[PDB]
């Protein structure tokens, strides 16, 4: 199954997933392709913040769905 991830820049990538994949797994795939550490990643789908322990199927994320990637910023 394939899904899309886009940033506000408009850049879109395609990920190979299965519905059982955790959000953690998806962040790990983004790290693989984009070099962005999981701790810096916030993913959103249909306005919902996706939490690390849950799966794509928990959020009813289907084939060809688009997730939004927003970077996280933490103080020193």
């Amino acid at each position: 199954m394939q899904i899309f991830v886009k940033t506000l820049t408009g850049k879109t990538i395609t990920l190979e997933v299965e519905p059982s994949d955790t959000i953690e797994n998806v962040k790990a795939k983004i790290q693989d392709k984009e070099g962005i550490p999981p701790d810096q990643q916030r993913l959103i789908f249909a306005g919902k913040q996706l939490e690390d322990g849950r799966t794509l199927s928990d959020y009813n994320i289907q084939k060809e769905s688009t997730l939004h990637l927003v970077l996280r910023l933490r103080g020193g």
Binding site: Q2, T12, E16, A28, Q31, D32, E34
Partner: protein, 215 residues
């Protein structure tokens, strides 16, 4: 026009394990499972797909998922490139490619991309043209399928996508394949650091070993 007609016509796909030959039906994902020996592999590079907690490679950062390990020139990665940059790889190496439809092409029933897919319809499957929007200069294909076509040429000619990487992509690639996060050594300026990474990558990490090549 040779390159495109080959992409468009019905293609073969072979299980890398048992060697049974199939006709490729487009429309699904990159994850294939042999109906003869149940082996799982990637259509883009023929590498195995492991179930979670079954991957034998050490230092695997995605160990807890169904994944394979793909080389840098597999469609798995290259499909994320713009059509322009894939065209550049081909142009830099003097490989011709189509931007216009075939010579005496036949019109497509509805509209859109002529690539035949086995699509999921209510209560089964059905062969049908892609039908997605076809941008000018994409040879009568949609965005995703046009990139697939360009990637078939790129693979057939053994072109290295790394020649076009920015330093960040080199670092992302170095970490993926050599498991070390690189950094400039002292005294190294940015042009030297970039060139060092491209050279270390070239000589330690081959292109896809199981991607069919031309001669």
């Amino acid at each position: 026009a040779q390159g495109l007609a080959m992409y468009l016509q019905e293609n073969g796909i072979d299980c890398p394990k048992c060697k049974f030959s199939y006709a490729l039906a487009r429309g699904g994902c990159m994850h294939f499972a042999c109906t003869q020996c149940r082996h799982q592999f990637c259509s883009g590079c023929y590498n195995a797909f492991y179930a979670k907690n079954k991957c034998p490679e050490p230092n695997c950062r995605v160990k807890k998922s169904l994944h394979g390990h793909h080389p840098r020139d597999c469609l798995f990665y290259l499909r994320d490139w713009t059509a322009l940059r894939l065209q550049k790889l081909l142009q830099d190496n003097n490989v011709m490619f189509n931007t216009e439809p075939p010579a005496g092409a036949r019109a497509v029933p509805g509209g859109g991309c002529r690539v035949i897919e086995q699509k999921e319809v209510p209560n089964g499957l059905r062969d049908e043209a892609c039908g997605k929007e076809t941008p000018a200069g994409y040879a009568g294909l949609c965005q995703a399928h046009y990139k697939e076509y360009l990637v078939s040429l790129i693979n057939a000619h053994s072109l290295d996508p790394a020649t076009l990487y920015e330093v960040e992509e080199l670092e992302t690639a170095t970490e993926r394949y050599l498991h070390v996060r690189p950094q400039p050594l002292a005294g190294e300026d940015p042009p030297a650091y970039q060139a060092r990474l491209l050279q270390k990558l070239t000589e330690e990490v081959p292109l896809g070993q199981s991607i069919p090549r031309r001669r």
